[PDB]
Write a protein that binds this DNA or RNA. Structure first.
Ligand SMILES: Nc1ncnc2c1ncn2[C@@H]1O[C@H](COP(=O)(O)OP(=O)(O)O)[C@@H](O)[C@H]1O
Lengths: 91, 81, 412, 78
DNA sequence: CGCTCAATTGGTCGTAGACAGCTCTAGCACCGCTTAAACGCACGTACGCGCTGTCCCCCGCGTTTTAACCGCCAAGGGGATTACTCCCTAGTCTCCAGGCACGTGTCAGATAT
C-alpha cells in the first residue's frame, strides 16, 4: 500500500488550528529571546502571533518544496529540495 | 533535556508537511526544517525585540512582532496593528 | 613573442624499400594520444635516419564533400585515456599513414608490423584493433609492446634480463612500471590519470582566468611553446614557489613573450607574464591536488609500489629508474626525481636515475631495434594463421612487451 | 511587433545569466515573461504620468513605477 | 478485474459555550458655525528635444549535418511508509509570589498666601 498518507493530506488541509505543541514552542521562543537579550518576556498573544507566522511560513516552505520535488519528477522530499526552495526564493 | 530544537517533534513537523501537501518525507527533513525554524525566529524575534526596545518595555506585545513581520513582508491579521 | 606551428611535410615515397636476406622490411608504428610516429625499420643500419609521419593524431573531414582531413595541414582523435576506442577515424588515420609509407601494389597491407599498445590494454580494444588489422588490412604477422619498454629496450646497457622501474608520461596518464628480469610485474604496476593534456589545459585555464583580455588568442597550440620550452619542474616545489615570493627575483626570472601584435599596446598584445605558472603546469604529476583530482601522484606511487617488495629486490631494481615519454622532457626532471627518491631510500643505499636519449622518439627507435633483432622469431609475432583461430584478444609474452592473461571474448 | 527582440538577443540574455544547455521553447515563453514584466513597468509608469496630466511619458514617472516595485535607478533623472 | 473483508467519512443526537441584541452609560471628537491664513487654479510666456525622411553598412537569419542529450525502458536494494509496541511530557489547574499601579499616609521641612 504505502500511500494512504494522501488521506492525512486531506485531513490536515481540512484542519486549520496550530500544529506545534504550545509549551515546546513557548520554551523555544523564550530560550531564543533570553540568549539574545536580558529580561524580554512575552504576552501569550505575542507567542501566538509568532507561532501563526512560523507555521504559515513552514506551510509555504513545504508547498514550495512540493513543487521543487514534482519538478524534479520525484514523489519524495530530500534536504536538497529545501535548499533549492531557499535559493530560488533568495532565502 | 530536549532543548536541541528536537522539542519541535517529528510528527508535528510531519503534520505541517502534510498540511503543506508533500508526500514521502526523508528522515533528514525534520532537522533541516528545525534549522529554518530557528533562522525564522533569528529574523522575527530579533526585529520584534527592536520594536520592544523602541519603548524599552519588558513585555513583548503582539504589536511589536506585527511591526517586525510588516517590515519583513509577512503581515498578519486578527491581532490588529 | 610566440612563434606558430608548421605543417605539410614531404613523406612521399615509392611503393617500399627492399633489404638483403628476407626481403620484407617491417613497418614500425607508434600510436599516440598526442602524436603518432611511424616508419619502415631501415634494417642493417644503426643510425636509423628517417622516422616519418611524426604527426598530431587528431582528424576531421570536409562535410561539404571535399576530403578526409586525416593528416597535418571541430576535431576528434581515436584514443581515450591512452587506449584506442574508435573505428571511423582510426581507419582514415591508418589509411593516411599507409598512403605516405606506401603499399606494395593492391588492397592488402603486404609487410609485417610492430605496433604500440597501452601499459595494460583492455581486451576488447585489442580485439577491435586486431580486427581492423587483420579483417581490413590483412597483415601477415604483427608484434605488440609498450612505448616505455621499447624506449627502455633502446636505452638498456645490454640486450639482457635487465630490471628496474620505468617512469612514463603522456597525454592522459603517467605510469610506474616495475620490471623484474625483463617481465612487467602487472599485479603491482600503477598509473596516475594526468599528464600533457591536463598540464596544457591547466596552463590554458590559468591564463584564461588571469588575463581576460585575450580569451580567444590563447589556445593549446600556443600553450605548447611555453609548456615545452619556457616551463621547468622544481627541484623542490615549496622551495621554488618560496623564491618567487619576492618581486626582485620575480621581475628578473619571469618569462614575458608577447602575443601576436597588431595605452602602451600590451593591454591588448600582452607579454603574458609567467613565473609560478611556468612551474604549476609541470608539478601536476607530482601533486595532482594542484588540479581537483585526488590521487597519490608520482612520489607517493613510487613509494607505494616499492614497499610491496622485500628489501633486497628493491635495492637491485631501484638501481635503474628510467624516465621516458611526454612530460619527462621538462628541464630539471632528473634533478627533481632523484631528490624525491633520496627522501625515501634507506639511509646509505645507492640508486641511479636514467633519462632517455630522446624522451619522445626512443619508443620508435626501441621498437625498430627490437624488430631488427626479433625479425624471424616466428613464435613471438602474432601470425595471420593464429588470428585465424585466436579471437583478437590474444597476445604473446615476449621481452619488452605487455603480460597476456588467458581469456576468451564472446562476439557476434 | 515583438519579433524586433531577436533570437540571438533572447539567447544572449540567458548567456549573460550564465546558462549552458537550453531548449528552444524557452525563447517565446521568455518573450511571454518579458511581455508581462515590460507591460507592468509601462502601465505603472503611464499611471504615474497621467497623475501629472502631461501627454509626454517622462523619466521620473518610470522611476516612481520602478521605485514602487522596489527598484532604484540613476543617470536618467537620478 | 470483481468479489469479502476490515476500516473510515459522513450522519443524528447532545449540551453548554460564545455569540450579538439589548440596556443603558457618559466620554468625547464629530458636526456647525464663523474667522482668518495663504496659496490653488489659473496661465501667460520662454522657446524645444520628440519625431519627419536621407545615406550606408550592420545583425539576424535560413540552411546544413554532426553528435550531446532528454525521454524512456527495466531492474537495483535500502530507506519511508503502515502499523504495533511502551515511555514520557503537553496540557490541566493548582497555589505561590511579585512587579506595576493606584491610593491613603503623614507630617516635615522646604516655599510661599
Ligand atoms: N611532447 C609530448 N608532449 C605530450 N605528450 C607526449 C609528448 N611526446 C610523447 N607524448 C606522449 O607519449 C605517450 C605514450 O607514448 P606514445 O609515443 O604516444 O605511444 P603510445 O601511446 O602507444 O604508448 C602518449 O600518451 C603521448 O601523449
Amino acid at each position: 500500500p504505502g500511500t494512504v498518507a494522501l488521506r492525512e493530506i486531506r485531513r490536515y488541509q481540512k484542519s486549520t488550528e496550530l500544529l506545534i505543541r504550545k509549551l515546546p514552542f513557548q520554551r523555544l521562543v523564550r530560550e531564543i529571546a533570553q540568549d539574545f537579550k536580558t529580561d524580554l518576556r512575552f504576552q501569550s498573544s505575542a507567542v501566538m502571533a509568532l507561532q501563526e507566522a512560523c507555521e504559515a511560513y513552514l506551510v509555504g516552505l513545504f508547498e514550495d518544496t512540493n513543487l521543487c520535488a514534482i519538478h524534479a519528477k520525484r514523489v519524495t522530499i530530500m534536504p536538497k529540495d529545501i535548499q533549492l526552495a531557499r535559493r530560488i526564493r533568495g532565502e | 533535556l530536549r532543548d536541541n530544537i528536537q522539542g519541535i517533534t517529528k510528527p508535528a513537523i510531519r503534520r505541517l508537511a502534510r498540511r503543506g501537501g508533500v508526500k514521502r518525507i526523508s528522515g533528514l527533513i525534520y532537522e533541516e526544517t528545525r534549522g529554518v525554524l530557528k533562522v525564522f525566529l533569528e529574523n522575527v524575534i530579533r526585529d520584534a525585540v527592536t520594536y520592544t526596545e523602541h519603548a524599552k518595555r519588558k513585555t513583548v506585545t503582539a504589536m511589536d512582532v506585527v511591526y517586525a513581520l510588516k517590515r519583513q513582508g509577512r503581515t498578519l491579521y486578527g491581532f490588529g496593528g | 613573442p610566440f612563434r606558430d606551428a608548421r605543417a605539410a611535410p614531404d613523406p612521399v615515397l615509392e611503393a617500399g624499400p627492399v633489404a638483403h636476406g628476407p626481403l620484407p622490411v617491417p613497418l614500425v608504428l607508434d600510436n599516440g594520444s598526442f602524436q603518432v610516429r611511424a616508419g619502415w625499420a631501415c634494417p642493417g643500419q644503426d643510425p636509423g635516419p628517417e622516422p616519418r609521419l611524426q604527426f598530431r593524431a587528431v582528424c576531421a573531414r570536409g562535410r561539404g564533400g571535399a576530403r578526409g582531413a586525416s593528416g597535418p595541414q571541430m576535431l576528434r582523435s581515436p584514443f581515450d585515456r591512452n587506449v584506442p576506442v574508435n573505428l571511423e577515424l582510426q581507419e582514415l588515420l591508418l589509411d593516411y599513414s599507409f598512403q605516405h609509407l606506401g603499399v606494395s601494389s593492391q588492397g592488402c597491407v603486404d609487410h609485417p608490423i610492430v605496433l604500440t599498445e597501452a601499459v595494460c590494454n583492455p581486451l576488447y580494444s585489442r580485439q577491435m584493433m586486431s580486427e581492423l588489422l587483420f579483417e581490413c588490412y590483412g597483415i601477415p604477422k604483427v608484434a605488440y609492446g609498450i612505448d616505455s619498454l621499447f624506449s627502455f629496450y633502446h636505452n638498456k646497457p645490454k640486450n639482457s634480463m635487465c630490471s628496474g622501474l620505468i617512469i612514463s608520461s603522456g597525454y592522459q596518464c603517467t605510469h610506474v612500471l616495475p620490471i623484474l628480469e625483463g617481465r612487467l610485474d602487472a599485479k603491482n604496476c600503477k598509473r596516475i590519470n594526468l599528464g600533457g593534456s591536463q598540464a596544457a589545459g591547466y596552463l590554458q585555464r590559468l591564463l584564461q582566468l588571469k588575463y581576460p583580455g585575450h580569451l580567444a588568442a590563447i589556445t593549446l597550440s600556443r600553450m605548447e611553446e611555453i609548456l615545452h620550452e619556457h616551463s621547468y619542474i622544481a627541484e623542490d616545489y615549496v622551495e621554488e614557489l618560496h623564491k618567487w615570493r619576492c618581486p626582485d627575483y620575480y621581475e628578473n626570472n619571469v618569462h614575458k613573450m608577447q602575443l601576436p601584435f597588431s595605452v602602451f599596446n600590451l593591454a591588448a598584445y600582452h607579454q603574458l607574464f609567467v613565473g609560478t605558472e611556468r612551474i604549476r603546469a609541470p608539478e601536476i604529476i607530482f601533486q595532482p591536488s594542484l588540479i581537483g583530482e585526488e590521487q597519490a601522484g608520482i612520489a607517493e606511487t613510487l613509494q607505494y609500489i616499492l614497499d610491496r617488495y622485500p628489501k633486497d629486490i628493491q635495492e637491485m631494481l631501484v638501481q635503474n629508474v628510467f624516465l621516458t615519454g611526454g612530460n619527462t622532457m621538462y628541464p630539471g626532471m632528473k634533478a627533481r626525481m632523484e631528490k624525491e627518491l633520496l627522501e625515501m631510500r634507506p639511509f646509505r643505499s645507492s640508486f641511479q636515475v636514467q633519462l632517455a636519449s630522446n624522451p619522445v622518439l626512443d619508443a620508435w627507435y626501441g621498437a625498430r631495434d627490437w624488430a631488427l633483432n626479433h625479425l624471424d622469431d616466428n613464435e613471438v609475432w602474432i601470425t595471420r594463421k593464429e588470428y585465424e583461430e585466436k579471437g583478437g584478444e590474444y597476445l604473446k609474452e615476449h621481452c619488452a612487451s605487455n603480460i597476456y592473461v588467458p581469456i576468451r571474448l564472446p562476439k557476434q
